[PDB]
Amino acid sequence: ATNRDQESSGFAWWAGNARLINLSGKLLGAHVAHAGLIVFWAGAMTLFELAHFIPEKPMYEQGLILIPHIATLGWGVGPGGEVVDTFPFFVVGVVHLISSAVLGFGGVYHAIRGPETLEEYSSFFGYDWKDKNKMTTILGFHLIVLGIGALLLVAKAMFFGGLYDTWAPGGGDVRVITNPTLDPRVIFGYLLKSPFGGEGWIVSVNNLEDVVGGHIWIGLICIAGGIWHILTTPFGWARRAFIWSGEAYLSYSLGALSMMGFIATCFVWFNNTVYPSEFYGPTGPEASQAQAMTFLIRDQKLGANVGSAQGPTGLGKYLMRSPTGEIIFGGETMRFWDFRGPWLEPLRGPNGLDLNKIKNDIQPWQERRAAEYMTHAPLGSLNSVGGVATEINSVNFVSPRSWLATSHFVLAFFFLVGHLWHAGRARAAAAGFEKGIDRESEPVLSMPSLD
Amino acid sequence: GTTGERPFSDIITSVRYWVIHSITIPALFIAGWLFVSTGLAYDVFGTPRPDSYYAQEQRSIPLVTDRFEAKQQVETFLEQLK
Amino acid sequence: RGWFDILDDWLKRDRFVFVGWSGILLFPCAYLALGGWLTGTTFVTSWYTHGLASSYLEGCNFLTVAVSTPANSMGHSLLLLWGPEAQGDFTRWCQLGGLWTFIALHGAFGLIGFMLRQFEIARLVGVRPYNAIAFSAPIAVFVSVFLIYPLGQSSWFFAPSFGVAAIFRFLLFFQGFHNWTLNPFHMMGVAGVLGGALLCAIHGATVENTLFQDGEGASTFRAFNPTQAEETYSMVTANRFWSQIFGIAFSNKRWLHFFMLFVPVTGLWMSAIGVVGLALNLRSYDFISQEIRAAEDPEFETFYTKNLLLNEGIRAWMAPQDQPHENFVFPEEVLPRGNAL
Amino acid sequence: METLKITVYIVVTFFVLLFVFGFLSGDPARNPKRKDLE
Amino acid sequence: AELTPEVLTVPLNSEGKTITLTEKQYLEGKRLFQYACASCHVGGITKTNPSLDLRTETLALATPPRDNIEGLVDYMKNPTTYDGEQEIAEVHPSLRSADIFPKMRNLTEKDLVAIAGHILVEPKILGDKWGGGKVYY
Amino acid sequence: ANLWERFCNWVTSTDNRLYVGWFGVIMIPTLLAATICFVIAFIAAPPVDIDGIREPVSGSLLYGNNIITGAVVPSSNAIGLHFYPIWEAASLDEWLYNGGPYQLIIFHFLLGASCYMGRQWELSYRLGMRPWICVAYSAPLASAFAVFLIYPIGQGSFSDGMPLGISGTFNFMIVFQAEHNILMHPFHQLGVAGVFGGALFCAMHGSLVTSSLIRETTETESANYGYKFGQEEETYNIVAAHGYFGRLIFQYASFNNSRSLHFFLAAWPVVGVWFTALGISTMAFNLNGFNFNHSVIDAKGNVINTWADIINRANLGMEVMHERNAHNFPLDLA
Numbered sequence A: 001a002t003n004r005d006q007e008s009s010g011f012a013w014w015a016g017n018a019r020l021i022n023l024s025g026k027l028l029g030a031h032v033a034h035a036g037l038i039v040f041w042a043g044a045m046t047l048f049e050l051a052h053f054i055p056e057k058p059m060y061e062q063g064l065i066l067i068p069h070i071a072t073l074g075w076g077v078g079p080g081g082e083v084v085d086t087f088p089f090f091v092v093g094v095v096h097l098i099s100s101a102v103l104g105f106g107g108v109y110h111a112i113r114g115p116e117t118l119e120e121y122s123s124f125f126g127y128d129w130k131d132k133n134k135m136t137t138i139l140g141f142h143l144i145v146l147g148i149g150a151l152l153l154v155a156k157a158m159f160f161g162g163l164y165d166t167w168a169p170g171g172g173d174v175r176v177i178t179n180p181t182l183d184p185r186v187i188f189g190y191l192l193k194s195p196f197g198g199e200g201w202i203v204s205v206n207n208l209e210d211v212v213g214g215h216i217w218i219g220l221i222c223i224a225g226g227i228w229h230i231l232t233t234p235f236g237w238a239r240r241a242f243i244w245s246g247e248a249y250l251s252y253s254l255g256a257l258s259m260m261g262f263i264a265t266c267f268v269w270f271n272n273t274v275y276p277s278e279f280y281g282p283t284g285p286e287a288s289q290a291q292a293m294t295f296l297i298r299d300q301k302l303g304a305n306v307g308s309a310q311g312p313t314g315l316g317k318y319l320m321r322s323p324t325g326e327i328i329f330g331g332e333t334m335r336f337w338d339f340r341g342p343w344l345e346p347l348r349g350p351n352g353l354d355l356n357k358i359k360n361d362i363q364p365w366q367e368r369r370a371a372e373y374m375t376h377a378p379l380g381s382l383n384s385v386g387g388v389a390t391e392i393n394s395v396n397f398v399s400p401r402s403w404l405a406t407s408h409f410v411l412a413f414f415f416l417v418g419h420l421w422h423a424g425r426a427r428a429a430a431a432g433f434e435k436g437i438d439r440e441s442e443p444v445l446s447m448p449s450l451d
Numbered sequence B: 001g002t003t004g005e006r007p008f009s010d011i012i013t014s015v016r017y018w019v020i021h022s023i024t025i026p027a028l029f030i031a032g033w034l035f036v037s038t039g040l041a042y043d044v045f046g047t048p049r050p051d052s053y054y055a056q057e058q059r060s061i062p063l064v065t066d067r068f069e070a071k072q073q074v075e076t077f078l079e080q081l082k
Numbered sequence C: 001r002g003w004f005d006i007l008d009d010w011l012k013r014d015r016f017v018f019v020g021w022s023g024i025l026l027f028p029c030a031y032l033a034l035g036g037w038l039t040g041t042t043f044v045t046s047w048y049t050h051g052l053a054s055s056y057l058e059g060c061n062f063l064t065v066a067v068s069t070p071a072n073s074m075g076h077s078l079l080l081l082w083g084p085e086a087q088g089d090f091t092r093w094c095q096l097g098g099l100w101t102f103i104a105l106h107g108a109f110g111l112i113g114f115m116l117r118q119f120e121i122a123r124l125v126g127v128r129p130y131n132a133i134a135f136s137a138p139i140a141v142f143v144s145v146f147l148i149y150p151l152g153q154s155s156w157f158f159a160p161s162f163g164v165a166a167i168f169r170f171l172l173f174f175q176g177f178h179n180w181t182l183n184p185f186h187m188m189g190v191a192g193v194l195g196g197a198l199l200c201a202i203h204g205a206t207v208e209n210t211l212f213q214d215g216e217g218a219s220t221f222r223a224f225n226p227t228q229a230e231e232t233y234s235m236v237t238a239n240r241f242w243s244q245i246f247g248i249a250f251s252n253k254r255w256l257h258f259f260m261l262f263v264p265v266t267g268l269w270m271s272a273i274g275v276v277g278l279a280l281n282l283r284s285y286d287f288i289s290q291e292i293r294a295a296e297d298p299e300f301e302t303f304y305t306k307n308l309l310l311n312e313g314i315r316a317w318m319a320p321q322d323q324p325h326e327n328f329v330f331p332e333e334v335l336p337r338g339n340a341l
Numbered sequence D: 001m002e003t004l005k006i007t008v009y010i011v012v013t014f015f016v017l018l019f020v021f022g023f024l025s026g027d028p029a030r031n032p033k034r035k036d037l038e
Numbered sequence E: 001a002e003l004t005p006e007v008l009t010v011p012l013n014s015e016g017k018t019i020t021l022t023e024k025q026y027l028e029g030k031r032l033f034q035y036a037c038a039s040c041h042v043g044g045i046t047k048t049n050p051s052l053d054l055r056t057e058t059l060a061l062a063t064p065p066r067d068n069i070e071g072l073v074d075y076m077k078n079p080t081t082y083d084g085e086q087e088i089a090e091v092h093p094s095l096r097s098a099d100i101f102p103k104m105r106n107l108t109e110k111d112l113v114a115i116a117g118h119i120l121v122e123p124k125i126l127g128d129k130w131g132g133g134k135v136y137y
Numbered sequence F: 001a002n003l004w005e006r007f008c009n010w011v012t013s014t015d016n017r018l019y020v021g022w023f024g025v026i027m028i029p030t031l032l033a034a035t036i037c038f039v040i041a042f043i044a045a046p047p048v049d050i051d052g053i054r055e056p057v058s059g060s061l062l063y064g065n066n067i068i069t070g071a072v073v074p075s076s077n078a079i080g081l082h083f084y085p086i087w088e089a090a091s092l093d094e095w096l097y098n099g100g101p102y103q104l105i106i107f108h109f110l111l112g113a114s115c116y117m118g119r120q121w122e123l124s125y126r127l128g129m130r131p132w133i134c135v136a137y138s139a140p141l142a143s144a145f146a147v148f149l150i151y152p153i154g155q156g157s158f159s160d161g162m163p164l165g166i167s168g169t170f171n172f173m174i175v176f177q178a179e180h181n182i183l184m185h186p187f188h189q190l191g192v193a194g195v196f197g198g199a200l201f202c203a204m205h206g207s208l209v210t211s212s213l214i215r216e217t218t219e220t221e222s223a224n225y226g227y228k229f230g231q232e233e234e235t236y237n238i239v240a241a242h243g244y245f246g247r248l249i250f251q252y253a254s255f256n257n258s259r260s261l262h263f264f265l266a267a268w269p270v271v272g273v274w275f276t277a278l279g280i281s282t283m284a285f286n287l288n289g290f291n292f293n294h295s296v297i298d299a300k301g302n303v304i305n306t307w308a309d310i311i312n313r314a315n316l317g318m319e320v321m322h323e324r325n326a327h328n329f330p331l332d333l334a
């Protein structure tokens, strides 16, 4: 029981995992076991979703979050997102589960039975947190692996089946991407776009060509950067800029992951390209716009001249102008005039929504889709009662977009707290005062008074 | 310092404690269960059963409206249930 | 020794749970209040007093169960089990809401007993009585809310019912009918509560981050000994930090801790005064100048007038079911409503 | 309005650059106990 | 009160003949109604067209009359506008549009009868609440 | 030393009456801008068309408000989440009509408050303290982010951010209850536990220390003069305080360790407020409080009301009355 008590390690049980900071073998075992946990959940949860899946009903009516991910990749679904074959879902679940068993075996071995420290057994796998060269070597290895993952996505899109394209001409379909966007102007203009309304930063990516080109660039850049960090060691300015310790590296990663969690929240809330509404349900903006469209259709069928219908406030009841003049839906949904979706874009012309097209060319499938989205807006209670808070019990529905956004905002925030905690502690421990103030050399006592 | 009572950990890790309580705890739990499943709770506390909130064709609540006749009003409501 | 002195000895024995003379009042009353709440929430209905289901036995959950107030027709009756209403019939007593007055009265006397316990223990161990003094705020809140307010209103019916959701309904009723948020006494109460939470957090964190290193462990809790004479954290360093961060800082620990007593206690007392006012419908409901201006000028609008519209909605839509004794029938056409909703 | 926009861009860039280069200017060594943190 | 056979007895055709639904029938109807219809018709209102509701009187005044089991089954097979002038299977769920409304694909004749029975019974239980909207919540 | 070296030494100096630091270099200008704009707007700004329906709401003192009713009004629903700096307006008149001051103020404030947290860390580092006071500050800061940025992002408009005023805050709260039933949401319940318990424990700790002060003064002098700033010995008897509180409840319910005690004081309210901030930030994506409307039904099928149904009636009143001219269609979907 080496270092497995507070007396010998300096750490209490509630901080026990800090006892592993300098025990590389047991720490590797811990990480492999936790990765086994991740893979195991993927497999078990996917199998649970499949066992509870009713193929006829939309995915988003059934509390599914993983099956939509598989379907978006083009597996198991056909035109309009209809499910034609669930065996790909089942295969994903089974394979992840078996792999989880293997990972668990490896992690338990490295954590319980294998060498406690790897430095003696091997210098290739052993490391010292303060060895910047070795640290950057491991970082580069994992960068190469990640780049390979991005290129795997590219391969799925281009050579093995393609991706589900909600924008495909005909009403959404699996499509093979053959002309990925390699234009750096486009790819990095995305990064330079403002995050505010009508711009949306990277969350605004609205076509699979741009998606695939972006991931091509990510894979190549990651491979090059990993080779770079294998072959180099940090320069002097970096050496003087950073804290070089295990806890510091953990803190940096906590900050990065928090940022990624917030970004994912926005992605799933706003983007209906890589999160097709056929699978994840309408976005909030989409559902609001859909209500506007639905009642425009109903009243116009009754005989209203929607272009000229004046609302109570003087603004158009059904149609008005955005602050830059585009014709848009009226009512509160004026805030959502940046929304774009395949069921709505056929009605849009150069100046915005086109009155002639609204009057003459709205199709039954558009009417049906608008009704569906209006009635599956992402609003619901914690016990999964669909609709506004004042609605009565009857509909058992909370949108996958709501579940995913809320969960990952919670995770991103707590990981920001983690970044702050571990970064502050890393600084204090590197400087040597993380256990408190030295009584005989209290820094403040040697400073001049403020007044 | 301690006040002389036997330690709780000592008591709850002892064979005699569990000899006694493996009988007593289940008995009390079953007593409560039966208190409900036999319907005695309804009678004791005057709580309506699912079929006793309304008369068959009634939709008005049996609200007590007189302070000193409230007991008789409740009894009249109960009779009207029949 | 005399029997009084022998009894004093036994009551003040040092045992796991101290009893004391105050115990003779505290323990039966506190037990009866708590047990009454659990009993009512588990088995008792609110059908004959409110037209509501309020117990686990009827199908409510922890958030919706309650021991509900008696019917409005009961007035302010004590509703004693042997009283003229229940006439010694336990089942009828429960159906008439005697459990609410039972809980409220045994709980009030239990609070008296607990404060007496604070005094008695302080006297026995030789400390000053400031914990008992600070407890006056919870007692003032309880008295003002659960006894004085209903005593000023038509009956116990409008006191808070002992339950989670029932308390929430109490909040919303106060907003809708009293415009309680606009009341400067509630505002001072809010300041006291939130400032107390702020002081609690900031002081805890400051101590924990100005600790002296008094041991080698990375977990710093073992480096304190209760009998030690030295301060465990650096007041000088904490004062320097807060002076440079926020401009001002504490420099006197005694003042710091008295201030921690003073803030939340004073806030709760102020809120109690406000509720005494509301017992008489003596509200901070309106600003007369704004009302005159708005009446004369249909383009004048502020968040104050918006909130008044919200209150009118609350009253109209909740009164018929929340006040069943009034027999309100509001035809649909009279309900206030905005466009389309 | 264009002059205002350019002025604000210049000011913000000034302060942000101060932030970045200041934290690059050997910040870890600016503590009372141990300087050589690499 | 109880869910009695008298409550469960509802009109069967346009000639006044009545049928007595079983309690299992009524519960199955409620479940199927939640499954296939409540997204728009929760509580008897119509979210995407509030002017039309599922109240028995409204069904009675519909053309053809829909205040009986057979009328409601026919509506679910071949829905029409209120005056019966237009067939709206293209925009309303039905067996003949089950290809575009998949939740209708597996419904059987007994299932449709159960849904219709639920629609007719629920107002007998809830009164104005059925089709009344938020005013009566 | 070179000019840059001297400037860095001044910026990071621990001898300045108010610490500046690198976080302060961002904090000072942004907080000054936010403060100046807020004060000017609160006093003098003209009415703002918050809901985008050409119905301006008056927020400023000079336009008929008092301290309780005044506010800086959120930007127009016509703007949504669009960035609306002064230079995006055709004129200051347009900017004011559309509520640009709100955006300027809240953005500069959020940035400055983030830098305030960082500055707490930085000065702790300069003074050789432990670093986690900033972690305590992250709770209220997270709450500010939730009500000024996250909720607007989720709902699609800064017009739904909390107004910068007292009555505006109340309006925000009431509408929030109408649309999300926050009272029935466990995270707000944890927030209430956090703040009620924070106040409770504040009073408890203050009262216990005050009750255990050691005699160093006479009855004609404030007991506070019994403590001298920077004295080595403790000023109260924690052993006596523990004897009292342990006998008040029972021995093992009372802290005998001051460090554990102060950690608990920090942790309770901070965690509670973290959770309430998450409650707002998750209801931003329309995951609302528990809905038990009509959960209890009798044998026939009659609805048996509960206190939750009464709450629902109140919520309906709020919902139907709020923003009375802004809705054209039956559902309020954001």
Ligand code: CLA
Pocket: A013, A014, A015, A016, A017, A018, A250, A254, A414, A415, A416, A417, A418, A419, A421, A422, A425
């Ligand atoms: C990659 C993520 C990561 C990693 C690897 C670490 C690793 C570490 N942290 Mg850091 N931490 C993180 C994220 C991370 N942390 C985040 C996000 C936060 C913010 C909350 C913190 C906050 C934090 C603090 C405050 C401290 C550490 C400490 C530590 C060390 C000991 C941890 C331990 O033994 O826990 C033991 C684990 C437990 C005691 C169990 C905790 C269970 C949590 C609180 C509840 C989880 C609920 C669950 C999700 C859902 C439950 C469902 C139920 C409600 C039904 C270790 C070096 C300690 C340290 O400084 O050591 C040097 C320390 O004091 N961490």
Ligand code: CLA
Pocket: A002, A003, A004, A005, A012, A013, A014, A015, A016, A017, A018, A019, A020, A023, A026, A027, A029, A030, A031, A033, A034, A101, A102, A103, A104, A105, A106, A108, A111, A112
């Ligand atoms: C993902 C979560 C996770 C992981 C991977 C680890 C991993 C580890 N912890 Mg940590 N820990 C955690 C959570 C976690 N911990 C939490 C939540 C707490 C707070 C309660 C702690 C508190 C804590 C302390 C206080 C200590 C550790 C220690 C350790 C290490 C040695 C454990 C040991 O000696 O086991 C001994 C235990 C056993 C022999 C019992 C059996 C354990 C096995 C692994 C169960 C596996 C079951 C599994 C189903 C088998 C599948 C096999 C199949 C695939 C074939 C190990 C690397 C110790 C350490 O660092 O030592 C240097 C240490 O002292 N941990």
Ligand code: CLA
Pocket: A028, A032, A099, A102, A103, A105, A106, A107, A109, A110, A114, A115, A118, A121, A122, A125
């Ligand atoms: C990142 C995870 C990781 C890392 C860094 C290590 C590292 C190490 N392990 Mg451990 N191990 C792991 C996972 C890991 N292992 C898992 C998951 C298992 C369970 C099967 C084991 C089971 C295991 C045993 C039983 C033993 C080791 C031993 C060793 C040491 C020698 C390994 C060697 O020479 O490789 C030789 C290289 C190979 C055999 C080729 C590996 C390439 C694989 C098969 C495919 C390509 C890799 C690819 C990226 C995998 C993708 C998986 C993805 C889905 C996650 C070394 C310290 C030995 C030791 O400690 O000696 C004292 C030892 O006896 N490991």
Ligand code: CLA
Pocket: A136, A139, A143, A191, A221, A222, A224, A225, A226, A228, A229, A232, A233, A234, A235, A238, D020
């Ligand atoms: C997991 C990813 C990862 C990580 C952790 C690192 C880590 C590191 N790299 Mg490597 N790098 C990577 C991937 C990564 N790299 C890849 C993929 C490439 C290929 C393009 C490189 C290419 C590369 C080079 C060429 C160099 C490094 C260097 C370094 C070191 C200094 C980093 C630094 O100062 O950053 C902090 C960054 C800065 C100080 C400059 C930019 C700071 C701006 C102002 C921040 C902008 C934030 C933005 C405005 C806010 C929103 C973000 C939004 C745009 C997403 C450090 C060890 C340096 C070194 O010493 O290596 C020998 C070096 O010269 N890296």
Ligand code: CLA
Pocket: C024, C025, C028, C029, C032, C078, C079, C080, C081, C082, C098, C101, C102, C103, C105, C106, C109
């Ligand atoms: C210290 C303990 C204590 C206290 C302060 C109270 C206080 C109260 N109880 Mg609770 N009660 C207690 C213990 C206590 N109870 C216990 C242990 C039980 C369980 C047995 C109960 C069971 C209980 C029930 C069931 C009810 C109460 C009720 C009440 C209220 C009315 C009491 C009343 O009118 O008494 C009046 C009695 C006295 C003031 C005693 C006077 C004693 C003098 C000396 C008598 C002198 C004359 C007399 C004829 C002596 C004759 C001597 C000779 C001729 C033989 C009051 C709030 C009622 C309530 O809550 O209503 C809503 C109610 O219904 N109590």
Ligand SMILES: CCCCCCCCCCCCCCCC(=O)OC[C@H](COP(=O)(O)OC[C@@H](O)CO)OC(=O)CCCCCCCCCCCCCCC
Pocket: B002, B006, B007, B008, B009, B010, C017, F248, F249, F250, F251, F252, F253, F254, F255, F256, F257, F260
């Ligand atoms: C030393 C503690 C310092 C840490 C601070 C604690 C944080 C706060 C914890 C509070 C809850 C305590 C959890 C126990 C913390 C703990 O350490 O537990 C251990 C403690 C003592 O356990 P043992 O008897 O095993 O003690 C071993 C001893 O030999 C020495 O430890 O157990 C109890 O006190 C639990 C008994 C429940 C007693 C229920 C009695 C009910 C009586 C009802 C009347 C009440 C009085 C009413 C007054 C009006």
Ligand SMILES: CC1=C(/C=C/C(C)=C/C=C/C(C)=C/C=C/C=C(C)/C=C/C=C(C)/C=C/C2=C(C)CCCC2(C)C)C(C)(C)CCC1
Pocket: A030, A033, A034, A036, A037, A040, A094, A097, A098, A100, A101, A102, A103, A104, A105, A107, A108, A111
């Ligand atoms: C170290 C440590 C730890 C951790 C641990 C872990 C984390 C582990 C993991 C583990 C794992 C991670 C495991 C795994 C497992 C797995 C398995 C064992 C699997 C199996 C599978 C199967 C058997 C399948 C089957 C099937 C199929 C194939 C098809 C479908 C159906 C079914 C499902 C039946 C703790 C915390 C305790 C603490 C101490 C130390």
Ligand SMILES: CC1=C(/C=C/C(C)=C/C=C/C(C)=C/C=C/C=C(C)/C=C/C=C(C)/C=C/C2=C(C)CCCC2(C)C)C(C)(C)CCC1
Pocket: A186, A187, A188, A190, A191, A202, A205, A210, A211, A213, A214, A215, A217, A218, A241, D019, D020, D021, D023, D024
């Ligand atoms: C995939 C994809 C794409 C693309 C993407 C990309 C291309 C990306 C990139 C990205 C990137 C490229 C990023 C970057 C980032 C960076 C960062 C995030 C940084 C940070 C930094 C830091 C953190 C710093 C710090 C500091 C300072 C500032 C001062 C001094 C000290 C220190 C150093 C600490 C797209 C959209 C097209 C589409 C979809 C898909």
Ligand SMILES: CC1=C(/C=C/C(C)=C/C=C/C(C)=C/C=C/C=C(C)/C=C/C=C(C)/C=C/C2=C(C)CCCC2(C)C)C(C)(C)CCC1
Pocket: C031, C032, C034, C035, C036, C037, C038, C039
């Ligand atoms: C009123 C009255 C009375 C009294 C009564 C009593 C005294 C009662 C009591 C009762 C009681 C005394 C009851 C109790 C009950 C209890 C319960 C019912 C409990 C529950 C619990 C729970 C459910 C919990 C849970 C949990 C969680 C969740 C987590 C953590 C852990 C725990 C376990 C805590 C007399 C006779 C004078 C007559 C007149 C009237």
Ligand SMILES: CCCCCCCCCCCCO[C@@H]1O[C@H](CO)[C@@H](O[C@H]2O[C@H](CO)[C@@H](O)[C@H](O)[C@H]2O)[C@H](O)[C@H]1O
Pocket: A236, A237, A238, A240, A241, D020, D024, D025, D026, D027, F002, F004, F005, F006, F008
């Ligand atoms: C917008 C992009 C901005 C960030 C771009 C990335 C820049 C990365 C490379 C820049 C390197 C800066 O290099 C860094 O310069 C500073 C300031 O002179 C040096 O700082 C050093 O000299 C200065 C004097 O000027 C002293 O005040 C300081 O205490 C000392 O550390 C650092 O030792 C060096 O590491």
Ligand SMILES: CCCCCCCCCCCCCCCCCC(=O)O
Pocket: C081, C082, C083, C084, C087, C088, C089
């Ligand atoms: C101060 C101490 C107060 C203690 C009061 C204990 C109360 C115990 C009451 C139990 C008996 C109730 C009498 C029931 C019969 C009364 C019927 C009637 O004549 O009205």
Ligand code: OEX
Pocket: A332, F051, F077, F155, F159, F160, F175, F179, F322, F323, F326, F332, F333, F334
């Ligand atoms: O702006 Mn403010 O408050 Ca949110 O929900 Mn819709 O939008 Mn309006 O209505 Mn309700």
Ligand SMILES: [Cl-]
Pocket: C306, C307, F171, F175, F321, F322, F323, F324
């Ligand atoms: Cl409003």
Ligand SMILES: [Cl-]
Pocket: A330, A331, A332, A333, F326, F327, F328, F329
């Ligand atoms: Cl609208």
Ligand SMILES: [Fe+2]
Pocket: C203, C207, C257, F205, F209
């Ligand atoms: Fe203290």
